[PDB]
Design an enzyme around this catalytic site. Structure first.
Site, short mmCIF file in Angstrom:
data_model
loop_
_atom_site.label_atom_id
_atom_site.label_comp_id
_atom_site.label_asym_id
_atom_site.label_seq_id
_atom_site.Cartn_x
_atom_site.Cartn_y
_atom_site.Cartn_z
N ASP A 276 -41.71 33.19 33.26
CA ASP A 276 -42.05 34.55 33.65
C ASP A 276 -43.48 34.69 34.13
OD1 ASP A 276 -39.54 35.29 33.05
OD2 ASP A 276 -40.07 36.93 31.69
N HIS B 161 -44.21 29.11 31.12
CA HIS B 161 -43.00 29.90 30.93
C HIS B 161 -42.57 30.52 32.26
CE1 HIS B 161 -43.06 30.55 26.29
NE2 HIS B 161 -42.25 29.57 26.64
N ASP C 145 -50.24 34.60 27.37
CA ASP C 145 -49.79 34.68 26.00
C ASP C 145 -50.79 33.98 25.10
OD1 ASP C 145 -47.64 35.48 27.58
OD2 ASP C 145 -46.50 33.65 27.19
N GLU D 210 -51.21 40.80 26.60
CA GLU D 210 -49.78 41.00 26.51
C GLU D 210 -49.43 41.66 25.19
OE1 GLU D 210 -47.75 39.43 24.25
OE2 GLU D 210 -49.10 37.91 23.43
N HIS E 227 -46.53 42.73 29.84
CA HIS E 227 -45.57 41.79 29.27
C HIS E 227 -44.97 42.32 27.98
CE1 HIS E 227 -43.67 37.88 28.60
NE2 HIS E 227 -44.11 37.51 29.78
N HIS F 180 -49.83 29.09 22.35
CA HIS F 180 -48.49 29.66 22.48
C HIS F 180 -47.59 28.75 23.30
CE1 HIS F 180 -45.42 32.40 24.34
NE2 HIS F 180 -45.83 31.80 25.44
N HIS G 138 -49.54 30.16 32.13
CA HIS G 138 -48.82 29.11 31.44
C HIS G 138 -47.52 28.76 32.15
CE1 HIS G 138 -47.57 32.99 29.98
NE2 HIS G 138 -46.59 32.51 29.24
ZN LIG Z 1 -44.96 32.60 27.76
ZN LIG Z 2 -45.35 36.04 29.20
#
Ligand SMILES: [Zn+2]
Ligand SMILES: [Zn+2]
Lengths: 154, 429, 718
Positions: B71, B69, B177, B202, B395, B156, B67
């Protein structure tokens, strides 16, 4: 095409402005430039003949074949000498040969029967040897109007 | 014939993330991630433990990005151009449209914290995304004639996915996620019973079993009926629209009149992020915002976008509004240390701004994490819906995973490895 | 250190040694230990222990509380490692055998915390950070540390194995500055190299290839003369034990005039004759890199490198080891050819290149490989047939092949070669079924080729006529990667070929610009960006499609739009124009007053750059300043000096220093010099050149943020 409406209905229930025929209503929506998918793709009847006689003189216009059925050279031929481009980009969603090799090794058929156009490489590209359907035991082939015997005994 | 895995990042932490997987014949890097809060080479993972061969492109075959994000996809422009890798990168479709923006935004924090020593320049953003080959959900794609991947839907964040890597007889599913309780935001993760050899998940919210929308709206409504201001930091994208749509629907059902603002500057996806919101699952009260009317009397709600209270808009607008008793701030997201967004959320209200000056605080401070994750209920339900042969945990943290593995191998009687940051983990088939 | 933070030390030490308060955080410990590293190693490390008998409390409690959380003891261990740097500090910390305590069984060495790799990594880093004096080496020897390290350098976490090997090489390189420790290291390395456990021998090889290369004392060669039998005989097992590490060891030992003084080159030749075609490549390349080599060995190397191309060109129409792997599969063959092209191009720009560097054969083989991969070659044997049937329609081969065939620009020769290579690149551009990760490298290579042909020539216009009807199709490909690469290539031309009226005949006769002019409305932003920069580098030449009718489009994209990239690229284009010389006052005004209120930061930065360019170009001081004030540069300056974003402020204070010095060299002049001299610059220059986190990374601030744990904070995606 004279089968537009039912065609789109059967594509939906299971921008494009379809029309029943070039004569009648269609001649009141003609805005150039345009894009016109038409009837039978062997350039020998239907409506495409009319346009191919209308746009066969302007080096701007273009025909774009999307059907492998009819060999395109001879097909386009009887409108020569023509000055319009003629691209040839065929769209065949069918099984290609690496996929059919994988499919055979997966399904493991005990034999195979394919027309003569396959067990030998194509004529135009004689040097390749990878587009022949490779399968063991060798694939029995058939020629036009022949009578094969699938060698199984009860 | 083995399957190797190594969480080069995400190892018993919620910081870095880089899962290097080696299937029988090929290598695949999963979720090439980043880590904020640092200011030198120690933020990106240590790729040097891959390059003990020829250079990358001979080694790997495809990198996957779950995704958007920061991280999971905040390291490509350093991994695709600096260390050197010309090989296909497989993302989802909305992530290829978002991750450029989130990167180009994080760069703003980086070059402003004066840490551009070994970094990726703007040119590398484009010159990395040009190596993307997007995939469509439920529609497998083939590379190398033996490495076929397939997408899924986990939510998410608009654009996330749970990817599935196949080499024929064996396969590994990876989940980024996901969310199993079908909150009305995006939906619940749906994976098909493929019965794979390995499943990785995660563990952000593990040791915990809708009130968020309730109390957030209540607190905003209370602080806005008193002539008091709100502050809500958020990225240029991500958790901003899952707040704008909430305010909108709550307001037209309540008919308020307070100016609402969401000023990204980097993009006007206040009316474009909705475009991609449709093919998966435009505003009335919301105007544009600038420096001019961030001071006028009257109740107000302001969405700034440097990130977790870094330099830029949020830090400045906040530093103005600290000396007020009726205003309040919320931090709908995790915070990284060395940032005032980490001083404030945990205690401290006696700050020291530029120089030796002293700033006081009399506002309210709230932490209502609007993130979307899963937990023991949903995690067990999904690992049941998958029927794996091993489950991995990333995670997350130390003790939550240590407690979770007990139940996981207890109820479903399935082996669950908990790899630390960098230990090899082999699983044979 | 500093008192302002010293007063915080006792409370934070207490909360560290006490676990009832919630657990600490990693980055906190890391930055705090960094602050210790930079405060201690820069001065005496004993007086700080004397003035502050509080750290010693922590370092004594760590081995007593027996319930330290996973991570606090790691920070404590690294702290004890960085403290015991000087011998005086070693003795001071030795008050109570504290160092043998925590770095011994009393510490975490034996207790059941030997599970989290972080504590072990901290232990190793600490040991390496303390062993800088012979007393510490004597400690390691008699107390016993290498004994446990041997076992340690076999665990499952590379983050520990690498550090262990580095620790071995450091304690070795400090030892002989044969001592017991050094002799034991040497004997262990030897008795490991003769073993048969692949990880153990891999560790032996990597510790050896660090030791060599990182040190070159006489004992290095006095030891390599001992190892050379043991290392060389490793090439007896049918699978080479540690292929890549063996290659690296050879490449590092070889690049020294010392070890070259008989068995070295001979065992390298045995290797070249023995190593399989997956690791011999890089070895032979590294060999050819070396300036000094017995030339027969370089012949052997370069020939076994050229094996694949001179092998393929015996399978078309103009030893079997390599051609075996050439017919094994699609993975192995593509890998071999990609590695060979990568190597063989990495060799070209070097001056130690062989002689005579072949150019005809290389180019012929390369164009054959590229065309074959496209799928229109002409085999002449069974191997040629099967190769054409395996490599057809690949990418890796085709991509690296374009990279090589474009590397061949420094190679001088007649135009015959240039046209030979263009006659395949033109084919590779307009080849249906060509991924977007191929056309880019193809365009790069076509450019390097077209810009190295010794007005223009007899073939340039012909090729351009045949090419632009390909730059007119791939400029509307349905995948924005191509829609960007094509525009970039057009820009490279418009920068390299702007004064060649024959090229302009080719281009204007084509229909390229009438498509770029339309792309500026493409949906995907990057397309718009590259389109704007292309039309900019174009209209600096006078090649407009059938200037203001582009300036309006630009300013419109600049005023309102849904992305950043187009704005921050149109500002770059405007900078290009105003610098080149392609009403000027009103222009700068209508760009500045509509670039200022934009929200992004890069745009405002480039705007300040535009203003700097304009100022330098316009600088009679009175009327000059009146003009420069009409556009309102002073407004934008004193408006965005105390700006939210800092790089903006850096650019602005630089511009204001420029303006101040330039007016010192020569509203009203008095009024403007006043309103400029009223504020400060140098102090502002300092507080802006400073970091954005100078406060929230200071030691005192970190201490506050650490010892104040116990609020709402858990961790989650950023
Ligand atoms: Zn995320
Ligand atoms: Zn993550």
């Amino acid at each position: 095409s004279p089968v537009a409406n039912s065609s789109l209905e059967f594509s939906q229930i299971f921008k494009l402005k379809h029309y029943p025929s070039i004569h009648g209503d269609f001649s009141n929506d003609f805005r150039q430039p345009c894009v016109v998918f038409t009837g039978h793709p062997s350039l020998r009847f239907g409506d495409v003949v009319h346009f191919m006689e209308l746009w066969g003189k302007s080096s701007l216009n273009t025909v774009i074949f999307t059907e492998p059925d009819f060999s395109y050279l001879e097909a386009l031929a009887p409108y020569q000498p023509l000055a319009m481009k003629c691209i040839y980009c065929p769209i065949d969603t069918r099984l290609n040969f690496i996929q059919v090799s994988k499919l055979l090794k997966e399904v493991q058929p005990l034999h195979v029967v394919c027309p003569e156009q396959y067990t030998q490489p194509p004529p135009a590209q004689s040097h390749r040897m990878d587009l022949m359907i490779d399968c063991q035991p060798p694939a029995m082939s058939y020629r036009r109007a022949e009578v094969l015997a699938l060698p199984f005994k009860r | 014939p083995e399957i190797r895995v190594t969480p080069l990042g995400a190892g018993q932490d919620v910081g870095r993330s880089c899962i290097l997987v080696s299937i029988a014949g090929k290598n695949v890097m999963l979720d090439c991630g980043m880590h904020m809060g640092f200011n030198d080479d120690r933020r990106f993972p240590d790729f040097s433990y891959i390059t003990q061969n020829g250079r990358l492109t001979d080694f790997l075959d495809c990198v996957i990005i779950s995704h958007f994000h920061l991280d999971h996809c905040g390291a490509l422009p350093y991994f695709s151009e600096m260390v050197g890798y010309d090989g296909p990168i497989y993302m989802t479709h909305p992530t290829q449209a978002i991750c450029p923006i989130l990167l180009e935004d994080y760069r703003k924090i980086a070059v402003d914290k004066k840490g551009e020593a070994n970094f990726f320049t703007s040119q590398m953003i484009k010159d990395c995304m040009k190596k993307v080959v997007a995939v469509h959900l439920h529609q497998t794609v083939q590379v190398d004639d033996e490495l076929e991947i397939k997408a899924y839907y986990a939510g998410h964040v608009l654009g996330a996915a749970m990817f599935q890597i196949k080499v024929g007889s064996e396969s590994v599913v990876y989940t980024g996620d996901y969310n199993m309780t079908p909150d009305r935001h995006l939906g619940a993760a749906w994976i098909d019973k493929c019965r794979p050899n390995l499943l990785i998940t995660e563990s952000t919210y593990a040791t915990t079993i809708r009130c968020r929308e309730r109390d957030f709206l209540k607190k905003v409504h209370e602080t806005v009926e008193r002539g008091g201001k709100v502050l809500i930091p958020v990225f240029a994208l991500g958790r901003a629209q899952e707040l704008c749509i909430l305010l909108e629907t709550f307001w037209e059902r309540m008919n308020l009149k307070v100016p609402i603002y969401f000023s990204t500057g980097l993009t006007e996806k206040a009316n474009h992020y909705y475009k991609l919101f449709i093919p998966w699952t435009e505003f009335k009260h919301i105007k544009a915002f600038d420096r001019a009317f961030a001071d006028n009397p009257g109740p107000m709600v302001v969405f700034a976008t440097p990130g977790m209270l870094h330099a830029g808009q949020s830090l400045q607008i906040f530093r103005k509004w600290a000396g007020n008793e009726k205003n309040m701030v919320i931090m709908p997201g995790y915070c990284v240390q060395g940032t005032v967004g980490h001083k404030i959320l945990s205690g401290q209200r006696k700050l020291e701004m530029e120089g030796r000056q002293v700033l006081e605080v009399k506002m309210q401070v709230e932490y209502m994490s609007f993130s979307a994750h899963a937990d023991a209920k949903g995690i067990m339900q999904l690992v049941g819906q998958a029927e794996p042969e091993s489950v991995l945990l990333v995670h997350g943290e130390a003790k939550k995973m240590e407690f979770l593995k007990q139940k996981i191998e207890q109820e479903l009687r399935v082996n669950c490895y908990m790899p630390a940051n960098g230990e090899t983990v082999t699983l044979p088939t | 250190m500093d008192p302002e933070c010293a007063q915080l030390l006792p409370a934070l030490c207490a909360v560290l040694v006490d676990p009832r308060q919630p657990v600490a955080d990693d980055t906190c410990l890391e930055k705090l230990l960094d602050w210790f590293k930079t405060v201690t190693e820069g001065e005496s490390s004993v007086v700080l222990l004397q003035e502050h008998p509080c750290l010693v409390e922590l370092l004594s409690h760590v081995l007593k509380v027996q319930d330290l959380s996973s991570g606090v003891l790691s920070f404590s261990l690294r702290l004890a490692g960085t403290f015991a740097a000087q011998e005086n500090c070693f003795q001071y910390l030795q008050q109570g055998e504290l160092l043998p305590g925590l770095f011994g069984e009393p510490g975490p060495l034996g207790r059941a915390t030997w599970a989290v790799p972080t504590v072990r990594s901290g232990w190793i880093q600490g040991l390496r950070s303390l062993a800088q004096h012979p007393s510490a080496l004597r400690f390691l020897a008699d107390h016993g540390a290498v004994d446990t390290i041997f076992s340690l350098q076999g665990d499952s976490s590379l983050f520990v194995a690498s550090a262990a090997s580095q620790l071995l090489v450091h304690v070795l390189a400090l030892s002989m500055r044969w001592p017991a420790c050094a002799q034991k290291i040497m004997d262990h390395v030897e008795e490991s190299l003769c073993s048969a456990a692949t990880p153990k021998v891999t560790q032996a090889l990597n510790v050896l290839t660090t030791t060599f290369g990182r040190c070159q004392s006489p004992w290095t060669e006095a030891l390599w003369v001992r190892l050379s039998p043991r290392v060389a005989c490793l090439l007896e097992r049918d699978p080479i034990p540690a292929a890549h590490s063996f290659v690296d060891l050879l490449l590092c030992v070889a690049r020294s005039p010392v070890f070259s003084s008989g068995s070295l080159w001979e065992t390298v030749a045995r290797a070249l004759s023995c190593l399989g075609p997956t690791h011999m490549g890089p070895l032979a390349l590294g060999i050819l890199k070396l300036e000094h080599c017995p030339q027969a060995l370089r012949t052997q190397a370069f020939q076994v490198l050229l094996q694949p191309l001179a092998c393929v060109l015996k399978a078309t129409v103009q030893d079997a080891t390599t051609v075996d792997t050439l017919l094994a599969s699609k993975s192995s063959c593509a890998g071999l050819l990609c590695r060979t092209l990568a190597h063989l191009e990495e060799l070209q720009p070097l001056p130690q290149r062989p002689s005579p560097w072949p150019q005809a054969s290389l180019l012929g083989a390369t164009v054959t490989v590229l065309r074959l991969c496209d799928g229109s070659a002409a085999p002449a044997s069974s191997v040629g047939g099967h190769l054409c049937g395996t490599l057809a329609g690949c990418v890796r081969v085709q991509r690296a092949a374009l990279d090589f065939l474009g590397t061949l620009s420094q190679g001088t020769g007649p135009q015959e070669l240039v046209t030979q290579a263009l006659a395949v690149l033109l084919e590779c551009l307009e080849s249906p079924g060509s991924s977007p990760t191929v056309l880019k490298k193809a365009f790069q290579a076509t450019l390097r080729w077209l810009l190295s042909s010794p007005d223009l020539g007899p073939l340039i216009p012909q090729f351009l006529r045949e090419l632009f009807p390909v730059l007119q199709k791939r400029l509307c490909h349905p995948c924005w990667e191509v829609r960007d690469s094509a525009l970039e290539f057009l820009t490279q031309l418009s920068r390299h070929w702007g004064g060649q009226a024959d090229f302009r005949c080719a281009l204007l006769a084509s229909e390229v610009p009438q498509l770029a002019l339309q792309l500026l409305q493409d949906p995907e932003s990057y397309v718009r960006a590259s389109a704007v920069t292309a039309m900019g580098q174009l209209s600096s030449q006078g090649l407009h499609a059938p200037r203001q009718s582009l300036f309006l489009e630009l300013l419109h994209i600049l005023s309102v739009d849904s992305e950043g990239f187009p704005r921050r690229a149109v500002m770059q284009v405007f900078t290009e124009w105003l610098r080149d010389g392609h009403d000027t006052e009103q222009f700068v005004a209508t760009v500045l007053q509509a670039a200022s209120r934009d929200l992004d930061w890069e745009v405002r930065a480039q705007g300040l750059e535009l203003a700097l360019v304009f100022l330098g170009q316009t600088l009679p001081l009175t009327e000059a300043l009146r003009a420069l004030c009409h556009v309102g540069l002073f407004d934008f300056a004193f408006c965005a000096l105390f700006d939210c974003d800092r790089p903006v402020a850096q650019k602005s204070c630089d511009l204001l220093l420029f303006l101040r010095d330039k007016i010192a060299s020569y509203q009203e002049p008095e009024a403007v010099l006043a309103m400029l001299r009223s504020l400060d610059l140098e102090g502002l220059r300092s507080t802006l050149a400073e970091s954005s986190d100078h406060v929230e990374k200071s030691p005192q601030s970190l201490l506050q943020d650490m010892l104040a744990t116990g609020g709402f904070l858990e961790a989650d995606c950023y």
